[PDB]
């Protein structure tokens, strides 16, 4: 049996992966199978907490697998008990399709380049038959197409042309969309538009230094360096995957889908170690495009569930992606053959300056009496590439006890062809000649499993409101009175809430069993998040049905085990009909969520209307949200940090 | 005559200040006068642009002054022509009161400590008569009190007790409020509550290291250092107050009121130097409190117009407030005697790493084909202290051509006393025993005088909207279609708009005379700003009347000279009645603002519901907004910056 991990939440080692895939091959001996997913099945929440805090049973070390079998529809999935090298649960799911791996994305180009119907369309589009090596595709999942459902595993090949291998292809989309059976390795259909648009004759819109020298004359000279050193080392301590820093303690996990998973998050409040979150991660996304024209409705990528923030994560880049003194973690997955694969340097961990933590000075001696303390932040990060997009993910811990998630979006716009006299608006932007960059949103589902100061939690909306008493009344003489209206969610239905600019809405995750001795309020972490777009696709749309979580900024449901992925476990090609994922968890909306084990799913992101500044490669666009302690502590928790400068009134008088 | 400045927008030198005050003293010879304000009167916008870009006349170098005269109500104000040492304009304003200086804050404590009625109240409150040296006050402007109007110059002494001079006084407010005549140096009234609350007998809530060692046992050890150096110097160049960095060029100005003023802001687009803004600054604030109980309606500080972001600015570190390699500017004002005073190191300028600028990698070779470029940002900052508050102001320029304003709020909560059995809610929070920190908002008025790619500009609201065609229609078959609805403001009235979470509203400031050759849209800078609270005080309230700008997120008016301060030129003790400031500029709402010289005033900020984490000293709370180029450039303007790492497809194949 494989050696068991240092910690029950540690991701599967390479040896554990191989042990799992050997087990599964033996169970299916005589069958031709391929591996889609081999990943840790995390322990039940109860089992973990009981092991960690109550001297309870050691949870079994289990691997979840998804396989395909040649000639069989759908997938099989199950669990392997690693200690006994045995399959302990298995089932066949003939009517779902699974996440697409890097191998799956790389496989489609050879299919389309050799398909006679595709060749014919390249030629009709102005690319000669002997130049197929110049044709490339981003082979998305089909997403959903009602002509096939889940009956075949399908990709849509978004086709482009490169004049030279070093080109950025996105200036030269083609007009047609081959549909490919991923498992049969064949083109089954090609969507061809009513109006044909041949390949752009313009130069490629390129962005490496050699290209830029041709385009603008010269690169800027190298700027003088800004160097960042920690000559006495770092202040954080890692014990395997467990982090300790500035009184925070937590486990850094990682998987094929979510990427970074932070677990067992506590804060050491002068010797009282107080839980905050059991688990926090990104659980799904949707990137819905806004052109109604066929087949563009199929562009609504659920990037986490369809590609994976782990599978697609970048090996980060000795001193370029992450600047400073860095601790790296590697990621391990299975390939289709059942062999472990490694992404080196998938996670970067470091501490960085974060400006001022607090300051106050006294006007009475011209600010001679003064105290200033600088902030340090701890950053746990990854960058994943989902075809054209780059998503830079930064989990940030702060010395006031706040935790923030910062995202920067970069990469390249998804582009489609635009005719010489064709107008892109209102659904997209002409960002370069013959290039239409369609409107789209990027929405994310943050999953919080809280344990604010322990178990038994609730959530609330907090709305700023003027007093209901009018100006000139004895209760509100001058019309200034205002308060925070807290609406505690009692049932699931109550939770289904949007951000509201009219009230500056925030949400509290709180422990109703405890009370701050000063304020009288429950200890809480407050979600402060304003990048909360409405879902623009209509009710009942394909987008709305496949992402039931995205229609509210906040969804709060009862905890149950295995409630991770809110668009279901196998996302590609689901029509959005059925009681699964968030739609299952919400149910009829009547279940209790007050003072219990809850899961808080937050929808946040941006609406992107492309502009030429975004092309050919887009400058980073920031998204953030923060979880802030409010009524958790009885005073500013950073005041024991040594100030950078401190002078008292008495000391200022003595300096004369 | 004083030597003329290097640049017409340079603030008055110390010699110019003295020259101006000598001129005014001579004009008023035989009269007993004191100086309130002596500051640059900036050139008219037409005159500046003509001088800068058209070989036009050199604008006269002018000083604006505000003086008080013993025995005369209100103020006198006027202009001095420095070249001729003469008063060129003067007028008496008998019914206004002016900004309170540092000297004016410092003067009140000696008055109240020696006043028999105040002493009596201290004794009734539990502080013996021989301990008046332990009584302190923050002597705000009265703000507005209908019992006196502007008929006397008045301060309200928010009173506190210190057990030792090194204490933070804010745990020990007293229950009463002396009203002080600033110019007569006497207490004229004391507001006494119906419910007396004697001084707290608790320990002070303190925050220096010596205090914290007593409170929690020990300070944390010094963390290992993070060192930032620039061994080959910085990439920016300053010529006097003119900055050049990453193709931006602008003038760094400073005054008593607004603090930092950025002017003549352009971007050098490969040799084509394109204007962006004529002037950008913070022009006013309001910090309205939410307790209706008398006299707390008088807490609605207009910090900029009542105290001044320049007058109240901190002399910065060095090495503590601003980390790294810093260029500092000093600030110069007049004191009451007409002598120049200096705040050393009032502004800090430096460049800092700002993470990734952009990245893209190709999945086809497992991300071997990759380009990553790191961002640098340029930061122009100050910190001002308005009694209890600290406001950290950062104007940030970025290498994608965006400009951001970042603010961090810190300092100390304003507190009032709380009885042992008194409930603070719903209008405040008990943050420590016997301490009530009332609810309040912090609202700011960002003033933008734009020149987007030159003169003749417009503004618009941009709202994301679903297509009006329903799901299932030929126009919107799958219900996903969406667009940006642009509402161009034709008249002032049209511009009076709020942030709307329902549409993810942004605003464009654009040049309708020009067209992006790719997109077809006008060049613009887009305001991306979501920390846009409603004003919670009711229509017709004292707050809403004194801050007419604050009731909309956006106000756009025609440019005229001297339209700087949207709550009027002399803010303290204005009732809010009258056609002045923003209310004058809005007029009847009918004036054209489409394709003309416009002023864009943006209201943003936060609503603060205190919690114990904020006490006794508050961790920094961030506020931000961004102005982003959209359709300004025809491609990402940063692509000529040398990448940190770049490998092409061909290079990756050659590396084997
Ligand atoms: Cu996008
Ligand atoms: Cu505040």
């Amino acid at each position: 049996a494989p050696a068991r991990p240092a910690h029950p939440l540690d991701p599967l080692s390479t040896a554990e992966i191989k042990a799992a895939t050997n087990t599964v091959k033996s169970y299916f001996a005589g069958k031709k199978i391929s591996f889609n997913t081999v990943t840790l099945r995390e322990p039940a929440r109860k089992a973990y907490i009981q092991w960690k805090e109550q001297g309870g049973p050691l949870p079994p070390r289990l691997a979840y697998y998804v396989i395909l079998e040649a000639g069989k529809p759908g997938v099989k999935e199950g669990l392997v008990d690693l200690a006994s090298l045995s399959v302990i649960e298995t089932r066949a799911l003939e009517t779902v399709q699974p996440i697409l791996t890097v191998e799956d994305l790389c496989s489609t180009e050879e299919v389309i380049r050799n398909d006679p119907a595709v060749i014919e369309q390249c030629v009709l589009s102005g690319i000669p038959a002997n130049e197929m090596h110049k044709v490339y595709c981003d082979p998305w999942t089909i997403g959903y197409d009602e002509r096939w459902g889940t009956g075949k595993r399908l990709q849509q090949a978004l086709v482009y042309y490169r004049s030279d291998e070093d080109d950025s292809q996105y200036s030269h989309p083609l007009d047609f969309c081959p549909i490919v059976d991923t498992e049969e390795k064949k083109v089954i259909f090609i969507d061809i538009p009513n109006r044909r648009r041949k390949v752009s004759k313009h130069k490629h819109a390129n962005f490496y230094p050699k290209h830029m020298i041709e385009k603008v004359g010269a690169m800027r000279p190298e700027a003088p360096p800004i160097n960042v050193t920690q000559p006495e080392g770092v202040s954080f301590k890692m014990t395997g995957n467990v982090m300790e820093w500035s009184n925070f303690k937590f486990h850094i996990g990682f998987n094929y889908r979510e990427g970074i998973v932070l677990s067992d998050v506590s804060y050491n409040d002068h010797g009282n170690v107080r839980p905050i979150f059991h688990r926090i991660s990104l659980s799904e996304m949707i990137v819905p495009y806004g052109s109604p024209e066929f087949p563009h409705q199929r562009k609504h990528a659920l990037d986490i569930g369809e590609y994976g923030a782990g599978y697609m994560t970048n090996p980060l880049s000795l001193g370029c992606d992450c600047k400073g003194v860095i601790h790296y973690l590697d990621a391990h997955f299975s390939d289709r053959a059942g062999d472990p694969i490694t992404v080196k340097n998938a996670v970067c961990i470091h501490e960085e300056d974060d400006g001022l933590l607090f300051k106050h000075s006294d006007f009475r001696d011209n600010f001679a009496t003064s105290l200033v303390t600088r902030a340090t932040k701890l950053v746990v990060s990854q960058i994943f590439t989902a075809a054209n997009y780059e998503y830079c993910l930064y989990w940030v811990f702060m010395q006031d006890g706040a935790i923030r998630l910062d995202i920067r979006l970069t990469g390249i716009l998804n582009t489609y062809i635009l005719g010489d006299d064709e107008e892109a608006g209102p659904w997209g932007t002409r960002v370069y000649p013959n290039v239409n960059a369609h409107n789209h949103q990027h929405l994310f589902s943050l999953r919080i499993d809280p344990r604010i100061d322990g178990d038994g939690n609730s959530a609330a909306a907090c709305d700023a409101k003027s007093s209901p008493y009018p100006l000139g009344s004895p209760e509100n003489m001058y019309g200034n009175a205002f308060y925070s209206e807290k609406t505690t969610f009692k049932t699931v239905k109550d939770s289904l809430t949007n951000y509201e600019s009219a009230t500056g809405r925030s949400w509290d995750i709180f422990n109703p069993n405890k009370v701050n001795p000063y304020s009288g309020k429950p200890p809480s972490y407050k979600l402060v998040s304003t990048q909360c777009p409405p879902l623009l696709a209509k009710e009942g749309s394909l987008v709305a049905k496949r992402a039931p979580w995205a229609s509210h900024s906040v969804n709060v449901v009862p905890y149950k085990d295995n409630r991770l992925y809110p668009s279901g476990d196998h996302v590609p090609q689901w029509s959005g009909d059925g009681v699964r994922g968030m739609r299952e968890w919400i149910g009829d909306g009547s279940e209790n969520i007050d003072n219990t084990d809850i899961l808080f799913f937050h929808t946040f992101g941006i609406t992107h209307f492309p502009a030429p500044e975004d092309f050919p490669l887009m400058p980073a666009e920031p998204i953030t949200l923060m979880l802030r302690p409010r009524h958790f502590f009885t005073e500013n928790p950073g005041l024991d940090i040594q100030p950078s400068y401190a002078m008292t009134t008495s000391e200022a008088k003595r300096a004369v």
Side-chain angles (χ1 to χ4, degrees), chain A:
Chain A
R4 60 157 299 123
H7 190 290
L9 301 182
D10 284 349
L12 300 183
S13 68
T14 59
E16 287 175 309
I17 289 162
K18 185 68 172 171
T21 63
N22 281 335
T23 300
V24 174
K25 288 178 181 186
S26 171
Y27 188 89
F28 291 103
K31 301 179 166 53
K32 166 76 159 196
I33 64 162
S34 63
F35 286 83
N36 170 267
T37 297
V38 180
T39 199
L40 179 63
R41 168 57 66 86
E42 288 174 29
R45 183 180 196 275
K46 177 197 171 274
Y48 179 85
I49 291 166
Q50 198 174 331
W51 169 76
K52 178 80 189 313
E53 304 183 353
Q54 306 170 211
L58 180 66
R61 184 75 173 160
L62 298 188
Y64 173 69
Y65 69 89
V66 178
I67 57 171
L68 296 269
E69 177 181 348
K72 300 285 174 168
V75 308
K76 287 180 267 287
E77 64 178 13
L79 296 176
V80 169
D81 178 85
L82 288 159
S84 64
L85 299 174
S86 70
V87 173
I88 65 165
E89 202 178 277
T90 179
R91 62 182 182 185
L93 301 173
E94 294 191 346
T95 63
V96 306
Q97 298 299 343
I99 193 166
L100 289 162
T101 70
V102 172
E103 287 183 303
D104 298 325
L105 300 183
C106 292
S107 79
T108 313
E109 275 164 355
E110 182 175 44
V111 175
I112 67 163
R113 286 174 180 149
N114 292 284
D115 179 70
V118 176
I119 297 165
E120 175 179 36
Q121 295 301 317
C122 288
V123 174
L124 286 172
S125 298
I127 299 167
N130 68 330
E131 295 182 30
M132 294 303 300
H133 75 278
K134 300 190 183 166
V135 178
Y136 290 76
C137 65
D138 290 356
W140 287 38
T141 174
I142 200 167
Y144 182 71
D145 192 308
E146 63 270 15
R147 291 170 297 179
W148 300 282
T150 50
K152 305 175 186 284
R153 193 178 184 189
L154 304 170
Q155 284 163 95
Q156 67 185 321
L158 306 177
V159 179
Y160 295 89
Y161 169 84
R162 294 191 202 174
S163 75
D164 175 79
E165 64 187 347
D166 287 351
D167 287 341
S168 190
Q169 72 202 21
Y170 296 98
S171 56
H172 286 67
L174 306 186
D175 75 358
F176 60 92
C177 186
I179 308 295
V180 178
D181 185 324
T182 298
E183 299 303 311
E184 294 297 308
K185 312 197 125 303
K186 82 188 154 73
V187 178
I188 69 160
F189 199 80
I190 315 178
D191 284 321
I192 291 167
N194 294 322
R195 167 209 178 124
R196 306 305 307 266
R197 291 113 146 161
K198 294 179 72 171
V199 68
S200 178
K201 295 177 189 207
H202 298 279
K203 295 170 193 168
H204 281 70
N206 285 328
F207 56 74
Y208 280 77
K210 62 183 184 178
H211 306 124
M212 290 309 300
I213 289 156
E214 301 190 293
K215 186 175 30 181
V216 307
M219 297 295 287
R220 297 178 210 190
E222 202 91 64
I226 298 174
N227 295 326
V228 176
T229 321
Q230 290 194 252
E232 297 176 45
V234 302
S235 77
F236 60 86
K237 184 188 180 199
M238 308 205 75
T239 311
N241 297 304
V242 178
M243 170 60 73
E244 294 171 274
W245 174 84
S246 192
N247 303 312
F248 283 108
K249 186 175 206 170
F250 58 92
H251 178 277
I252 303 175
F254 198 83
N255 67 57
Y256 74 111
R257 186 157 175 167
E258 295 165 271
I260 295 164
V261 177
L262 303 176
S263 297
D264 197 16
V265 181
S266 65
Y267 185 94
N268 183 356
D269 184 3
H270 288 108
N272 182 13
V273 173
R274 302 175 66 188
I276 295 166
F277 303 138
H278 181 65
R279 194 176 190 276
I280 185 162
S281 65
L282 292 170
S283 70
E284 193 46 278
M285 287 174 63
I286 193 162
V287 184
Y289 284 73
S291 173
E293 297 178 6
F294 194 89
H296 308 308
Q297 77 285 353
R298 304 197 303 253
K299 295 193 292 188
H300 54 271
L302 295 97
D303 288 319
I304 284 177
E306 297 185 317
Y307 306 108
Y311 285 160
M312 302 295 145
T313 213
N314 294 355
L316 306 167
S317 171
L318 153 176
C320 302
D321 295 288
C322 309
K323 185 167 172 165
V325 172
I326 314 303
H327 186 118
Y328 290 99
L329 306 178
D330 294 340
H332 307 112
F333 315 125
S334 181
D335 72 16
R336 281 179 70 115
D339 297 320
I341 58 176
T342 298
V343 180
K344 292 244 88 208
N345 309 130
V347 181
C348 85
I349 300 155
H350 68 299
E351 65 187 356
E352 302 180 36
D353 260 85
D354 197 25
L356 293 191
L357 195 56
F358 47 70
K359 180 174 191 191
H360 181 67
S361 305
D362 193 335
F363 64 85
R364 292 170 185 76
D365 59 13
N366 264 251
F367 310 129
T369 289
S370 190
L371 185 142
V372 194
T373 297
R374 293 199 61 87
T376 303
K377 62 181 166 174
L378 180 71
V379 178
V380 184
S381 164
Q382 66 167 309
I383 303 178
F384 79 95
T385 301
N388 59 291
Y389 305 118
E390 260 77 16
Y391 298 104
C392 315
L393 311 175
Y394 307 89
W395 298 93
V396 181
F397 291 74
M398 288 177 298
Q399 293 188 295
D400 70 342
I403 298 165
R404 174 175 105 221
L405 171 59
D406 288 339
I407 297 182
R408 291 190 185 190
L409 306 183
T410 184
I412 298 176
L413 293 164
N414 155 269
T415 57
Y416 180 64
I417 195 167
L418 187 72
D420 293 349
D421 299 311
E422 185 182 349
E423 170 67 58
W427 318 123
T429 305
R430 183 173 182 266
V431 293
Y432 190 75
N434 299 303
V435 182
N436 186 349
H438 294 148
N439 300 339
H440 57 283
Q441 305 185 271
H442 302 258
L443 303 176
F444 303 79
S445 185
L446 179 71
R447 178 184 183 285
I448 304 171
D449 177 351
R451 286 190 79 220
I452 306 295
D453 220 10
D455 290 288
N457 290 0
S458 303
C462 297
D463 287 319
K465 301 272 200 193
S466 307
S467 171
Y469 292 90
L471 172 71
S473 63
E475 296 83 358
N476 196 16
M477 179 57 59
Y478 301 92
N480 58 307
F482 75 81
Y483 68 106
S484 180
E485 179 173 277
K486 178 180 179 177
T487 299
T488 297
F489 303 145
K490 303 301 186 186
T491 65
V492 174
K493 184 170 168 165
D494 296 324
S495 78
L496 305 179
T497 47
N498 295 326
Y499 178 64
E500 298 290 353
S501 55
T503 58
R505 181 168 284 177
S506 57
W507 294 261
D508 286 357
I509 309 170
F510 65 99
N511 188 320
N513 306 289
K514 295 191 174 180
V515 186
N516 186 288
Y518 291 172
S519 62
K521 303 302 186 190
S524 79
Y525 265 64
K526 180 179 282 299
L527 175 64
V528 183
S529 180
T530 68
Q531 291 173 278
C532 294
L535 178 68
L536 289 168
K538 305 281 180 175
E539 303 179 21
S541 59
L542 179 54
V543 168
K545 294 170 68 175
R546 293 186 72 223
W549 50 273
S551 56
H552 298 91
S553 304
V554 165
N555 306 265
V556 179
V557 300
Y559 179 80
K560 300 195 180 180
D561 294 322
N562 307 319
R563 282 187 172 194
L564 294 184
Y565 305 128
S567 290
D569 288 349
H570 295 296
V571 176
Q573 299 171 244
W574 182 45
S575 62
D577 302 289
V579 181
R580 66 169 75 171
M582 180 65 71
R583 185 176 302 122
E584 182 188 302
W585 310 338
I586 288 177
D588 69 3
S590 75
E591 296 163 77
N592 178 54
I593 53 169
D594 187 14
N595 199 356
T596 192
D597 300 328
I598 64 176
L599 290 169
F600 188 115
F601 287 83
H602 180 51
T603 299
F604 71 100
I606 61 149
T607 298
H608 191 172
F609 293 110
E613 287 80 0
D614 296 333
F615 202 75
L617 196 197
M618 90 181 72
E621 179 169 356
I623 318 174
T624 190
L625 61 92
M626 189 173 21
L627 291 151
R628 301 184 80 204
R630 305 302 281 168
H631 311 275
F632 196 87
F633 298 109
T634 56
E635 76 169 3
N636 175 345
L639 294 177
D640 64 340
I641 298 169
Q642 301 276 8
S644 307
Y645 179 73
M647 175 168 281
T648 60
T649 293
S650 63
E651 292 167 342
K653 289 176 173 217
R654 263 178 267 141
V656 287

PDB file of all heavy atoms in Angstrom, chain A residues 642-654:
ATOM      1  N   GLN A 642       5.504  45.104  15.818  1.00  0.00           N
ATOM      2  CA  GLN A 642       6.404  46.256  16.106  1.00  0.00           C
ATOM      3  C   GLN A 642       6.180  47.360  15.097  1.00  0.00           C
ATOM      4  O   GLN A 642       6.253  47.120  13.885  1.00  0.00           O
ATOM      5  CB  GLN A 642       7.887  45.823  16.048  1.00  0.00           C
ATOM      6  CG  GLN A 642       8.215  44.740  17.016  1.00  0.00           C
ATOM      7  CD  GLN A 642       8.531  45.201  18.415  1.00  0.00           C
ATOM      8  OE1 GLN A 642       8.374  46.401  18.791  1.00  0.00           O
ATOM      9  NE2 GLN A 642       8.964  44.234  19.220  1.00  0.00           N
ATOM     10  N   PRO A 643       5.978  48.611  15.562  1.00  0.00           N
ATOM     11  CA  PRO A 643       5.803  49.687  14.593  1.00  0.00           C
ATOM     12  C   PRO A 643       7.061  49.965  13.824  1.00  0.00           C
ATOM     13  O   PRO A 643       8.137  49.650  14.338  1.00  0.00           O
ATOM     14  CB  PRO A 643       5.413  50.911  15.427  1.00  0.00           C
ATOM     15  CG  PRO A 643       5.232  50.444  16.796  1.00  0.00           C
ATOM     16  CD  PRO A 643       5.679  49.023  16.953  1.00  0.00           C
ATOM     17  N   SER A 644       6.936  50.533  12.632  1.00  0.00           N
ATOM     18  CA  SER A 644       8.061  51.000  11.890  1.00  0.00           C
ATOM     19  C   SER A 644       8.618  52.291  12.516  1.00  0.00           C
ATOM     20  O   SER A 644       9.781  52.597  12.376  1.00  0.00           O
ATOM     21  CB  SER A 644       7.625  51.259  10.443  1.00  0.00           C
ATOM     22  OG  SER A 644       6.997  50.058   9.993  1.00  0.00           O
ATOM     23  N   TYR A 645       7.742  53.099  13.114  1.00  0.00           N
ATOM     24  CA  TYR A 645       8.155  54.363  13.771  1.00  0.00           C
ATOM     25  C   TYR A 645       7.136  54.609  14.841  1.00  0.00           C
ATOM     26  O   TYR A 645       5.900  54.482  14.586  1.00  0.00           O
ATOM     27  CB  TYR A 645       8.150  55.522  12.806  1.00  0.00           C
ATOM     28  CG  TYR A 645       8.543  56.823  13.500  1.00  0.00           C
ATOM     29  CD1 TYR A 645       9.861  57.025  13.860  1.00  0.00           C
ATOM     30  CD2 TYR A 645       7.642  57.782  13.801  1.00  0.00           C
ATOM     31  CE1 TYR A 645      10.255  58.198  14.476  1.00  0.00           C
ATOM     32  CE2 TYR A 645       8.011  58.960  14.453  1.00  0.00           C
ATOM     33  CZ  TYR A 645       9.338  59.161  14.768  1.00  0.00           C
ATOM     34  OH  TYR A 645       9.737  60.342  15.393  1.00  0.00           O
ATOM     35  N   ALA A 646       7.615  54.951  16.037  1.00  0.00           N
ATOM     36  CA  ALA A 646       6.732  55.293  17.117  1.00  0.00           C
ATOM     37  C   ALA A 646       7.380  56.353  17.987  1.00  0.00           C
ATOM     38  O   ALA A 646       8.512  56.151  18.413  1.00  0.00           O
ATOM     39  CB  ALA A 646       6.426  54.089  17.950  1.00  0.00           C
ATOM     40  N   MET A 647       6.669  57.451  18.227  1.00  0.00           N
ATOM     41  CA  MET A 647       7.108  58.470  19.212  1.00  0.00           C
ATOM     42  C   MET A 647       5.882  58.922  19.993  1.00  0.00           C
ATOM     43  O   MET A 647       4.901  59.369  19.392  1.00  0.00           O
ATOM     44  CB  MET A 647       7.683  59.690  18.511  1.00  0.00           C
ATOM     45  CG  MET A 647       8.014  60.791  19.514  1.00  0.00           C
ATOM     46  SD  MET A 647       8.998  62.105  18.779  1.00  0.00           S
ATOM     47  CE  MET A 647      10.538  61.186  18.869  1.00  0.00           C
ATOM     48  N   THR A 648       5.969  58.863  21.318  1.00  0.00           N
ATOM     49  CA  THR A 648       4.895  59.289  22.188  1.00  0.00           C
ATOM     50  C   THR A 648       5.021  60.776  22.429  1.00  0.00           C
ATOM     51  O   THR A 648       6.029  61.438  22.082  1.00  0.00           O
ATOM     52  CB  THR A 648       4.957  58.613  23.542  1.00  0.00           C
ATOM     53  OG1 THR A 648       6.228  58.966  24.155  1.00  0.00           O
ATOM     54  CG2 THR A 648       4.887  57.123  23.467  1.00  0.00           C
ATOM     55  N   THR A 649       3.992  61.331  23.047  1.00  0.00           N
ATOM     56  CA  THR A 649       3.956  62.745  23.362  1.00  0.00           C
ATOM     57  C   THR A 649       5.090  63.151  24.310  1.00  0.00           C
ATOM     58  O   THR A 649       5.708  64.196  24.087  1.00  0.00           O
ATOM     59  CB  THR A 649       2.592  63.123  23.947  1.00  0.00           C
ATOM     60  OG1 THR A 649       1.589  62.985  22.943  1.00  0.00           O
ATOM     61  CG2 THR A 649       2.543  64.563  24.461  1.00  0.00           C
ATOM     62  N   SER A 650       5.312  62.331  25.327  1.00  0.00           N
ATOM     63  CA  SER A 650       6.393  62.558  26.270  1.00  0.00           C
ATOM     64  C   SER A 650       7.752  62.507  25.601  1.00  0.00           C
ATOM     65  O   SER A 650       8.608  63.399  25.829  1.00  0.00           O
ATOM     66  CB  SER A 650       6.348  61.595  27.449  1.00  0.00           C
ATOM     67  OG  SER A 650       6.495  60.217  27.182  1.00  0.00           O
ATOM     68  N   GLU A 651       7.948  61.524  24.747  1.00  0.00           N
ATOM     69  CA  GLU A 651       9.189  61.447  24.015  1.00  0.00           C
ATOM     70  C   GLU A 651       9.347  62.648  23.100  1.00  0.00           C
ATOM     71  O   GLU A 651      10.462  63.144  22.946  1.00  0.00           O
ATOM     72  CB  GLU A 651       9.276  60.171  23.194  1.00  0.00           C
ATOM     73  CG  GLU A 651       9.386  58.892  24.010  1.00  0.00           C
ATOM     74  CD  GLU A 651       9.159  57.628  23.199  1.00  0.00           C
ATOM     75  OE1 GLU A 651       8.571  57.678  22.061  1.00  0.00           O
ATOM     76  OE2 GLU A 651       9.516  56.535  23.744  1.00  0.00           O
ATOM     77  N   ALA A 652       8.269  63.113  22.458  1.00  0.00           N
ATOM     78  CA  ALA A 652       8.420  64.250  21.584  1.00  0.00           C
ATOM     79  C   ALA A 652       8.838  65.491  22.408  1.00  0.00           C
ATOM     80  O   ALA A 652       9.678  66.250  21.972  1.00  0.00           O
ATOM     81  CB  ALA A 652       7.162  64.571  20.786  1.00  0.00           C
ATOM     82  N   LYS A 653       8.239  65.673  23.569  1.00  0.00           N
ATOM     83  CA  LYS A 653       8.614  66.832  24.429  1.00  0.00           C
ATOM     84  C   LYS A 653      10.092  66.736  24.858  1.00  0.00           C
ATOM     85  O   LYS A 653      10.750  67.755  24.950  1.00  0.00           O
ATOM     86  CB  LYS A 653       7.768  66.911  25.670  1.00  0.00           C
ATOM     87  CG  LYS A 653       6.344  67.325  25.403  1.00  0.00           C
ATOM     88  CD  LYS A 653       5.533  67.288  26.686  1.00  0.00           C
ATOM     89  CE  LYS A 653       4.154  67.879  26.413  1.00  0.00           C
ATOM     90  NZ  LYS A 653       3.624  68.680  27.536  1.00  0.00           N
ATOM     91  N   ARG A 654      10.570  65.540  25.181  1.00  0.00           N
ATOM     92  CA  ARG A 654      11.990  65.341  25.554  1.00  0.00           C
ATOM     93  C   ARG A 654      12.967  65.568  24.388  1.00  0.00           C
ATOM     94  O   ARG A 654      14.093  65.946  24.621  1.00  0.00           O
ATOM     95  CB  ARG A 654      12.242  63.932  26.061  1.00  0.00           C
ATOM     96  CG  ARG A 654      12.245  63.707  27.544  1.00  0.00           C
ATOM     97  CD  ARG A 654      12.470  62.223  27.811  1.00  0.00           C
ATOM     98  NE  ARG A 654      11.196  61.491  27.946  1.00  0.00           N
ATOM     99  CZ  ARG A 654      10.933  60.273  27.473  1.00  0.00           C
ATOM    100  NH1 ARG A 654      11.830  59.595  26.756  1.00  0.00           N
ATOM    101  NH2 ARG A 654       9.717  59.733  27.686  1.00  0.00           N
TER     102      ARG A 654
END
